[PDB]
Amino acid sequence: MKEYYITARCTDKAHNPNEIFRSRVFAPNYVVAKSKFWMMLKKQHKVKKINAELLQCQPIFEKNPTVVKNYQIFLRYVSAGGIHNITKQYRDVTRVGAVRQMYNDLASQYRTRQDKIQLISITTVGDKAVKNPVLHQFVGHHVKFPMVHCKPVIASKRFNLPIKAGKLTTKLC
RNA sequence: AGGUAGAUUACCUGACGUUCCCAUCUGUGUGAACAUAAUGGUACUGAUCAGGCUCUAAGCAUCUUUACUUCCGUGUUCGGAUGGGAACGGGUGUAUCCUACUUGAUAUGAACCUACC
Predict the structure, then answer these.
(1) Is any atom of strand B within 7 angstroms of residue A76's beta carbon?
(2) How far, rounded to the nearest angstrom, does the alpha carbon of residue A10 sit from its chain's CA centroid?
(3) CA–C1' span, A113 to B93, in Å?
(4) Radius of gyration, alpha carbons of chain A
(5) Using CA atoms, how far apart are residues A147 and A124, in angstroms rounded to an integer?
(6) Nucleotide closest to A13 measured between CA and C1'
(7) Please, what is the Cα angle at A103 between A101 and A108, to 5 degrees?
(8) How far: A40 CA to B98 C1' (Å)?
(9) Quick one: how far is CA A114 from the chain centroid?
(10) Neighbouring residues of A72: CB distance < 8 A, sequence distance ≥ 6
(11) Where's the Large ribosomal subunit protein eL20 domain (predicted)?
(12) Are the C-beta atoms of A131 and A123 separated by less than 8 Å?
């Protein structure tokens, strides 16, 4: 997933040529981001590609992709019953990574493919604003858990033998 | 300003009231003859004592209507395309096209030839 900052304007009798539309669109590549941007303008401001013209489409990178932040994502997804607004919380270091988590999470928990979700907004919440029952347990300052039943780690595919010698074991790790 | 012939055929229609008529138009007087009908009401003809009462025309109205624009609304619907989702029924996403009703704002005619004022 990648971020893009897209601006454009419409030059026709219905829209003044001083209104500039901005967005921050998540897409695998800039071609997809532009297509997402143009669907918003058409579905909200009656602005079409033939009657408008793009100004900027530049990537947005995380300022510090080394600090862990609590991301709160507001989104709407279409189900069989109807359309619902859902708030999900994820922990990650980059905005694009958290949005990639959201898409994979929604596709598994709600069986909702990518082309049924619209990311309304994504902000950063505080430490104590995390309400996810599972995610809340790793937010404190004294999180500590022994990882058990470990599978021994192979350094590379070079040492991956099909049949080994002796017995096999797990690791208290 | 008015009258004749018009073209566009409601922005020209319909209802409620208002304003002049100096010329013009209209309404207005009469029935001998052409002509007319059950009726000089119509149509016809002869005329000029009166009149802006109506017609016509100009304007009024939170007037119906009609005519442009926005909005409705990129919502209805739709052309193209899956080993897309659904047990069906039906309904996505993508590249596109995109009404209508309604409502709101404005308007209530423009314009040609001839004659007379």
Answers:
(1) no
(2) 29
(3) 10
(4) 22
(5) 29
(6) B70
(7) 95
(8) 17
(9) 11
(10) A87, A88, A89, A122, A123, A124, A125, A129
(11) 1-122
(12) no
Report d(CA A91, CA A73) in Å as an integer.
11
Question: Which bases on strand B have an atom closer than 7 Å to a protein beta carbon?
Answer: 70-71, 73-75, 82, 84-85, 92-98
Six-digit token pair at A163? Answer: 């049949």
Residue A42, CA: closest nucleotide via C1'? B74
- The C1' atom of B95 and the CA atom of A148 lie apart, in whole Å, by 52
Q: Contact at 8 Å (CB) between A45 and A15?
A: yes
To one decimal, the resolution in angstroms is 2.8
The token pair that represents A139 in the structure block = 């937010």
Experimental method: cryo-EM
A156 touches strand B (CB under 7 A): no
Residue type for position A116? K
The reply to whether the CB atom of residue A38 sits less than 7 A from any atom in nucleic acid chain B is: yes
